[PDB]
Amino acid sequence: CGETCFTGTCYTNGCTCDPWPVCTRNGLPV
Secondary structure (H helix, E strand, C coil): CEEEEECCCCCCCCECCCCCCCCEEEEEEC
């Protein structure tokens, strides 16, 4: 994703705060 989710929330869609503080796009930290 490239984005970070220190708040446990992604700012960009298609990503989830799985590997905090980083977002996972389709299960990948891209």
